[PDB]
Amino acid sequence: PIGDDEDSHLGDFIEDTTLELPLDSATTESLRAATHDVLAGLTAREAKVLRM
């Protein structure tokens, strides 16, 4: 227990550092969208090779 003996124990303060922030997920979504739109602008072989 941290002080004043409340229901506050040490377990309710430990943050999770293994998650990713949702803003990073928004960047990843927008980056996949932008890269798909840009690789659409290439030729067939160049886009196929660059995806492969």
Spatial contact of 25 and 32, defined as CB atoms under 8 Å apart: no
The type of residue at 1 is P
Give the H/E segment covering residue 39: helix 22-40
Window 30-49: residues binding other proteins (CB under 8 A): 30-32, 35
The residue assigned the tokens 């160049």 is 46
Minimum CB distance to other proteins, residue 14 (Å): 5
Minimum CB distance to other proteins, residue 48 (Å): 14
Positions touching other proteins (CB under 8 A) are 1, 7, 10-16, 19, 21-23, 25-32, 35, 50
